[PDB]
Protein backbone atom coordinates (compact mmCIF):
# COMPACT_ATOMS: atom_id res chain seq x y z
CA UNK A 1 0.00 0.00 0.00
CA UNK A 2 1.80 3.22 -1.32
CA UNK A 3 0.68 6.95 0.07
CA UNK A 4 -0.49 8.75 -3.29
CA UNK A 5 -2.39 4.85 -3.63
CA UNK A 6 -4.31 3.80 -0.21
CA UNK A 7 -5.47 0.59 -1.70
CA UNK A 8 -3.74 -3.20 -0.76
CA UNK A 9 -2.27 -3.78 -4.04
CA UNK A 10 -0.90 -7.41 -4.22
CA UNK A 11 2.13 -8.04 -6.03
CA UNK A 12 1.37 -10.19 -9.00
CA UNK A 13 4.90 -12.24 -9.63
CA UNK A 14 5.66 -15.15 -7.49
CA UNK A 15 8.27 -14.57 -5.06
CA UNK A 16 10.61 -16.28 -2.04
CA UNK A 17 12.60 -13.57 -0.50
CA UNK A 18 12.76 -9.75 -1.54
CA UNK A 19 16.16 -9.60 -0.27
CA UNK A 20 16.44 -5.93 -1.48
CA UNK A 21 13.81 -3.54 -2.40
CA UNK A 22 13.71 0.62 -3.68
CA UNK A 23 13.56 3.56 -5.89
CA UNK A 24 16.19 4.31 -8.21
CA UNK A 25 16.62 6.51 -11.43
CA UNK A 26 14.40 6.18 -15.01
CA UNK A 27 12.67 3.17 -13.20
CA UNK A 28 10.43 4.69 -9.94
CA UNK A 29 10.01 1.93 -7.61
CA UNK A 30 11.96 -1.73 -7.76
CA UNK A 31 12.24 -5.01 -5.64
CA UNK A 32 15.25 -7.78 -5.66
CA UNK A 33 14.67 -11.74 -4.79
CA UNK A 34 13.74 -14.87 -6.93
CA UNK A 35 10.56 -16.48 -7.81
CA UNK A 36 10.68 -20.94 -7.02
CA UNK A 37 24.88 -23.15 -12.88
CA UNK A 38 28.07 -20.92 -12.60
CA UNK A 39 26.81 -18.88 -15.32
CA UNK A 40 27.62 -15.26 -14.66
CA UNK A 41 24.03 -14.02 -16.82
CA UNK A 42 21.99 -16.44 -15.34
CA UNK A 43 21.96 -15.21 -11.97
CA UNK A 44 18.01 -16.67 -10.89
CA UNK A 45 17.53 -13.24 -8.66
CA UNK A 46 14.60 -11.41 -10.50
CA UNK A 47 14.63 -7.33 -10.34
CA UNK A 48 10.79 -6.83 -10.32
CA UNK A 49 9.50 -3.38 -11.71
CA UNK A 50 6.66 -2.33 -9.01
CA UNK A 51 3.17 -2.06 -10.21
CA UNK A 52 2.57 -5.60 -11.42
CA UNK A 53 5.36 -4.68 -14.40
CA UNK A 54 7.81 -6.61 -16.20
CA UNK A 55 11.02 -8.59 -14.01
CA UNK A 56 12.57 -5.32 -15.62
CA UNK A 57 16.19 -7.47 -15.68
CA UNK A 58 17.55 -11.43 -15.28
CA UNK A 59 21.02 -10.01 -16.80
CA UNK A 60 23.89 -9.20 -14.73
CA UNK A 61 23.07 -9.93 -10.50
CA UNK A 62 24.64 -12.35 -7.96
CA UNK A 63 25.01 -16.16 -9.40
CA UNK A 64 22.70 -19.13 -8.15
CA UNK A 65 25.45 -20.57 -6.73
CA UNK A 66 25.22 -17.53 -3.99
CA UNK A 67 21.16 -17.72 -4.57
CA UNK A 68 20.85 -20.77 -2.06
CA UNK A 69 23.44 -19.08 1.14
CA UNK A 70 22.38 -15.79 0.68
CA UNK A 71 20.27 -13.89 3.46
CA UNK A 72 20.28 -10.02 3.04
CA UNK A 73 21.40 -7.71 -0.01
CA UNK A 74 22.23 -4.21 -0.14
CA UNK A 75 23.26 -1.86 -3.27
CA UNK A 76 26.05 1.05 -3.32
CA UNK A 77 25.93 2.31 -7.20
CA UNK A 78 23.24 1.84 -10.59
CA UNK A 79 24.81 2.17 -13.87
CA UNK A 80 22.70 2.01 -17.46
CA UNK A 81 24.77 1.09 -20.12
CA UNK A 82 22.14 0.42 -22.58
CA UNK A 83 18.49 -1.31 -21.95
CA UNK A 84 21.37 -3.86 -19.70
CA UNK A 85 22.43 -2.39 -16.70
CA UNK A 86 25.43 -2.53 -14.15
CA UNK A 87 24.99 -2.71 -10.26
CA UNK A 88 27.87 -3.14 -7.46
CA UNK A 89 26.49 -4.47 -4.49
CA UNK A 90 26.91 -6.39 -1.06
CA UNK A 91 25.36 -9.38 -0.40
CA UNK A 92 25.92 -10.94 2.85
CA UNK A 93 26.18 -15.25 3.54
CA UNK A 94 24.38 -17.62 6.04
CA UNK A 95 28.26 -18.72 6.19
CA UNK A 96 29.50 -15.29 7.98
CA UNK A 97 31.26 -13.50 4.68
CA UNK A 98 30.78 -10.27 3.29
CA UNK A 99 30.90 -9.92 -0.42
CA UNK A 100 31.74 -7.20 -3.24
CA UNK A 101 29.66 -8.01 -6.50
CA UNK A 102 29.82 -5.74 -10.02
CA UNK A 103 27.66 -7.09 -12.22
CA UNK A 104 27.30 -9.97 -10.89
CA UNK A 105 31.12 -10.49 -10.51
CA UNK A 106 32.58 -11.45 -6.80
CA UNK A 107 35.47 -9.73 -5.69
CA UNK A 108 37.10 -8.24 -2.06
CA UNK A 109 35.52 -10.76 -0.10
CA UNK A 110 36.00 -10.70 4.09
CA UNK A 111 35.26 -12.99 6.49
CA UNK A 112 32.55 -11.76 9.46
CA UNK A 113 34.01 -12.83 12.59
CA UNK A 114 29.80 -13.45 14.18
CA UNK A 115 27.42 -15.55 13.92
CA UNK A 116 24.27 -14.73 11.74
CA UNK A 117 24.69 -11.48 10.06
CA UNK A 118 21.07 -9.46 9.69
CA UNK A 119 21.79 -5.89 7.83
CA UNK A 120 24.16 -3.16 6.83
CA UNK A 121 24.51 0.40 7.01
CA UNK A 122 26.84 2.37 5.04
CA UNK A 123 29.97 5.11 6.76
CA UNK A 124 31.38 7.80 4.82
CA UNK A 125 33.53 9.53 7.70
CA UNK A 126 35.54 11.65 5.59
CA UNK A 127 38.73 11.51 3.36
CA UNK A 128 39.78 7.40 2.27
CA UNK A 129 37.76 6.34 5.82
CA UNK A 130 34.95 4.52 4.35
CA UNK A 131 33.19 1.42 6.17
CA UNK A 132 30.06 -1.16 5.34
CA UNK A 133 28.57 -1.39 9.05
CA UNK A 134 27.07 -4.75 9.89
CA UNK A 135 24.46 -5.90 12.36
CA UNK A 136 24.02 -9.68 13.77
CA UNK A 137 20.59 -10.99 15.62
CA UNK A 138 23.39 -12.07 18.15
CA UNK A 139 23.13 -8.48 19.62
CA UNK A 140 26.37 -7.76 18.47
CA UNK A 141 27.80 -5.57 15.10
CA UNK A 142 30.67 -4.76 12.99
CA UNK A 143 32.33 -2.00 11.22
CA UNK A 144 34.80 -3.44 8.24
CA UNK A 145 37.35 -1.12 6.56
CA UNK A 146 36.04 -0.43 2.23
CA UNK A 147 39.16 0.08 0.17
CA UNK A 148 40.32 -3.75 1.87
CA UNK A 149 37.96 -5.90 3.10
CA UNK A 150 39.33 -6.08 6.23
CA UNK A 151 37.57 -5.97 9.93
CA UNK A 152 37.94 -2.45 11.66
CA UNK A 153 36.22 -3.17 14.81
CA UNK A 154 33.49 -5.91 16.36
CA UNK A 155 31.94 -4.42 19.47
CA UNK A 156 29.23 -6.94 21.57
CA UNK A 157 25.74 -6.82 23.08
CA UNK A 158 24.86 -3.75 21.16
CA UNK A 159 21.44 -3.34 22.01
CA UNK A 160 20.78 -0.73 19.21
CA UNK A 161 23.26 0.36 15.99
CA UNK A 162 23.11 4.00 14.41
CA UNK B 1 33.33 -17.24 -12.10
CA UNK B 2 35.32 -20.85 -11.51
CA UNK B 3 37.41 -19.13 -14.44
CA UNK B 4 38.30 -16.38 -12.66
CA UNK B 5 39.12 -18.27 -9.57
CA UNK B 6 41.29 -21.24 -11.55
CA UNK B 7 42.93 -18.15 -12.95
CA UNK B 8 43.50 -16.46 -9.44
CA UNK B 9 45.26 -19.46 -8.03
CA UNK B 10 47.48 -20.32 -10.88
CA UNK B 11 48.00 -16.69 -11.09
CA UNK B 12 49.32 -16.62 -7.60
CA UNK B 13 51.11 -20.14 -7.50
CA UNK B 14 53.17 -18.31 -10.58
CA UNK B 15 53.77 -15.43 -8.33
CA UNK B 16 55.03 -17.74 -5.69
CA UNK B 17 57.26 -19.76 -7.74
CA UNK B 18 58.93 -16.13 -8.87
CA UNK B 19 59.40 -15.39 -5.38
CA UNK B 20 61.31 -18.35 -4.48
CA UNK B 21 63.77 -18.52 -7.97
CA UNK B 22 64.08 -14.62 -7.75
CA UNK B 23 64.78 -12.07 -5.08
CA UNK B 24 66.31 -10.68 -1.85
CA UNK B 25 65.29 -12.48 1.32
CA UNK B 26 62.74 -9.99 2.70
CA UNK B 27 60.52 -9.31 -1.21
CA UNK B 28 60.80 -13.11 -1.68
CA UNK B 29 58.63 -12.92 1.90
CA UNK B 30 56.56 -10.08 0.97
CA UNK B 31 55.32 -11.81 -2.44
CA UNK B 32 55.27 -15.38 -0.57
CA UNK B 33 52.49 -14.00 2.05
CA UNK B 34 51.06 -11.97 -0.46
CA UNK B 35 49.82 -15.07 -2.60
CA UNK B 36 49.38 -17.01 1.26
CA UNK B 37 46.62 -14.57 1.75
CA UNK B 38 45.35 -14.66 -1.81
CA UNK B 39 45.11 -18.18 -1.38
CA UNK B 40 43.12 -17.73 1.77
CA UNK B 41 40.59 -15.27 0.20
CA UNK B 42 40.10 -17.60 -2.60
CA UNK B 43 39.87 -20.46 0.15
CA UNK B 44 37.04 -18.76 1.58
CA UNK B 45 35.06 -17.27 -1.45
CA UNK B 46 34.90 -21.10 -2.40
CA UNK B 47 34.72 -22.58 1.45
CA UNK B 48 31.42 -20.15 1.17
CA UNK B 49 29.29 -22.23 -1.73
CA UNK B 50 27.88 -25.30 -0.76
CA UNK B 51 29.78 -28.47 -2.26
CA UNK B 52 29.79 -28.11 -5.94
CA UNK B 53 31.42 -31.20 -7.70
CA UNK B 54 33.30 -29.01 -10.45
CA UNK B 55 34.41 -26.50 -7.89
CA UNK B 56 35.64 -29.60 -5.67
CA UNK B 57 38.84 -30.02 -8.18
CA UNK B 58 40.35 -26.77 -7.67
CA UNK B 59 39.19 -26.63 -3.87
CA UNK B 60 41.36 -29.40 -2.61
CA UNK B 61 43.61 -28.17 -4.99
CA UNK B 62 43.47 -24.74 -3.46
CA UNK B 63 44.30 -26.05 -0.02
CA UNK B 64 47.51 -27.83 -0.98
CA UNK B 65 48.85 -25.28 -2.31
CA UNK B 66 48.05 -23.21 0.74
CA UNK B 67 49.10 -26.13 3.14
CA UNK B 68 52.67 -26.56 1.05
CA UNK B 69 52.94 -22.60 0.81
CA UNK B 70 51.77 -22.17 4.33
CA UNK B 71 53.92 -24.88 5.74
CA UNK B 72 56.93 -24.26 4.06
CA UNK B 73 57.08 -20.77 4.95
CA UNK B 74 56.62 -22.07 8.98
CA UNK B 75 59.47 -24.18 8.29
CA UNK B 76 57.46 -26.72 9.56
CA UNK B 77 53.60 -28.47 10.06
CA UNK B 78 50.87 -27.80 12.67
CA UNK B 79 47.40 -29.32 12.86
CA UNK B 80 46.18 -26.01 11.65
CA UNK B 81 46.60 -27.79 8.39
CA UNK B 82 45.26 -30.95 9.33
CA UNK B 83 41.67 -29.05 10.18
CA UNK B 84 41.87 -27.78 6.43
CA UNK B 85 42.39 -31.15 5.24
CA UNK B 86 39.32 -32.11 7.83
CA UNK B 87 37.09 -29.58 6.30
CA UNK B 88 38.02 -30.15 2.48
CA UNK B 89 37.18 -33.88 3.32
CA UNK B 90 34.26 -33.39 4.92
CA UNK B 91 32.89 -31.00 1.77
CA UNK B 92 33.95 -33.97 -0.58
CA UNK B 93 31.45 -36.48 1.52
CA UNK B 94 28.64 -33.80 1.80
CA UNK B 95 28.59 -34.21 -1.79
CA UNK B 96 27.64 -37.70 -1.60
CA UNK B 97 31.34 -36.62 10.35
CA UNK B 98 33.24 -39.20 13.05
CA UNK B 99 37.42 -38.78 12.25
CA UNK B 100 39.59 -38.57 9.65
CA UNK B 101 40.68 -42.34 9.31
CA UNK B 102 36.50 -43.24 8.77
CA UNK B 103 36.45 -39.69 6.51
CA UNK B 104 39.43 -41.21 4.48
CA UNK B 105 37.78 -44.93 4.04
CA UNK B 106 34.26 -43.36 2.94
CA UNK B 107 36.14 -41.22 0.72
CA UNK B 108 38.33 -43.50 -0.98
CA UNK B 109 35.13 -45.54 -1.82
CA UNK B 110 33.14 -42.27 -3.28
CA UNK B 111 36.19 -41.77 -5.66
CA UNK B 112 36.27 -45.64 -6.34
CA UNK B 113 33.12 -43.96 -7.66
CA UNK B 114 35.25 -42.19 -9.98
CA UNK B 115 34.08 -38.65 -9.75
CA UNK B 116 37.84 -37.40 -12.24
CA UNK B 117 39.61 -35.49 -9.15
CA UNK B 118 41.81 -38.16 -7.84
CA UNK B 119 45.21 -36.14 -9.38
CA UNK B 120 44.21 -33.85 -5.59
CA UNK B 121 42.94 -36.37 -3.68
CA UNK B 122 46.39 -38.98 -4.06
CA UNK B 123 47.90 -35.29 -3.49
CA UNK B 124 46.02 -34.87 -0.24
Known amino acids: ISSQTGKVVSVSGNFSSIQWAGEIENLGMVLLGLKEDYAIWNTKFCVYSLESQEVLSDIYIIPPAYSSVVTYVHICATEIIKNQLRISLIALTRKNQLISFQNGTPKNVCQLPFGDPCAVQLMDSGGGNLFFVVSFISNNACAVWKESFQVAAKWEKLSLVL | ?124
Open chain 2, 1 to 124: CLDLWREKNDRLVRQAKVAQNSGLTLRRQQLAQDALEGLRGLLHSLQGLPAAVPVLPLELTVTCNFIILRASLAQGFTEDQAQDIQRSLERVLETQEQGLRELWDSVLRASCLLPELLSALHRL
